[PDB]
Paper text:
Strigolactones (SLs) and karrikins (KARs) are two classes of structurally related molecules that mediate signaling pathways to stimulate seed germination. SL and KAR have been reported to be recognized by the homologous proteins [name] (DWARF14)14–17 and [name] (HYPOSENSITIVE TO LIGHT; also known as KAI2, KARRIKIN INSENSITIVE2), respectively. To elucidate the structural basis of ligand specificity, we determined the crystal structures of [name], ShHTL4, ShHTL7, and ShD14 and compared their structures with those reported for ShHTL331 and ShHTL529. All the structures were highly similar to one another, consisting of a canonical α/β [name] domain and a helical cap.
Residue numbers in the entry: 2 to 270
């Protein structure tokens, strides 16, 4: 299939229950490597890479399509229809959280449940909302990406994963970051940091399970609280006693059980 080839779609497990695992910026579907073995016995598991990941063809990259998160939401829908999947649980890491939120407002029929890991509808600050970042901070971040991409990746990965340089996850993430073509990495990260999905949250109807590390460089806990307060369907908040923006990769011993519970169980009342 077209989307299956372009997004490295892999379908594992078995059964009528389907779980889609969608990774965030700088990594790929390997971010789920410790969760997948605990799902395949009970679920059909759909893995894919978002366009622009270092595992995808950079000559392909459609800069206009991916200048807005709507392009990534369209990709999710196209993958499910190409796979003829009419219903799934969608687990979205970082940017893939809001991508699933957007896809669920366009096509609520495709999702029985959203599970977000370190999602945020807005990273910039305004007088009534603290996203965590201001404009000149972002400017200097983007200039570092342009000036020395390898040095940027090497400094960014430990801060993002929230661990020392020699952490396994830091080293994995350093490598997947540096496999992105620098102009594509910059374009995607600008699309992410300048997004605003806040107006869409009240229009969500799919129940959402909102997960993050208590200490996440990219997501203040107050943002997760804001998501819970703004969503138009049922939702539950579970802040984890972990540090890091890729907690399913760096702290799987405790984060995999959290994800399993929220994939498996419905919100009470
Ligand atoms: Mg991201
Ligand atoms: Mg206001
Ligand atoms: Na639904």
């Amino acid at each position: 299939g077209l989307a299956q080839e372009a997004h490295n779609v892999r379908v594992l497990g078995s059964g009528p229950q389907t779980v889609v695992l969608a990774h965030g910026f700088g990594t790929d579907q390997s971010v789920w490597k410790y969760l997948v073995p605990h799902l395949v016995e009970d679920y059909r598991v759909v893995l894919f890479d978002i366009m622009g990941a270092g595992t995808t063809n950079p000559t392909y990259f459609n800069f206009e399509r991916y200048s807005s998160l709507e392009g990534y939401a369209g990709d999710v829908i196209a993958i499910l229809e190409e796979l003829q999947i009419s219903s799934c649980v969608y687990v979205g890491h970082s940017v893939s959280a809001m991508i699933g939120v957007i896809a669920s407002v366009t096509r609520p029929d495709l999702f029985t449940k959203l599970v977000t890991v370190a999602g945020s509808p807005r990273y910039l600050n305004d007088p009534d909302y603290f996203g965590g970042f201001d404009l000149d901070e972002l400017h200097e971040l983007f200039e570092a990406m342009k000036e020395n991409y390898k040095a940027w990746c090497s400094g960014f990965a430990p801060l993002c994963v929230g661990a020392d340089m020699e952490s396994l996850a830091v080293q994995e993430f350093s490598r997947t970051l540096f496999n992105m073509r620098p102009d594509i990495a910059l374009s995607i990260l600008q699309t992410i940091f300048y997004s605003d999905v806040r107006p869409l949250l009240p229009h969500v109807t799919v129940p959402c399970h909102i997960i993050q590390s208590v200490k996440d460089l990219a997501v203040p806990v107050a943002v997760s609280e804001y998501i819970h307060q703004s969503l138009g369907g049922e939702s539950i908040l579970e802040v984890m006693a972990t540090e890091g923006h890729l907690p399913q990769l760096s702290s799987p011993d405790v984060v995999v059980p959290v994800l399993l519970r929220h994939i498996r169980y419905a919100i009470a009342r």
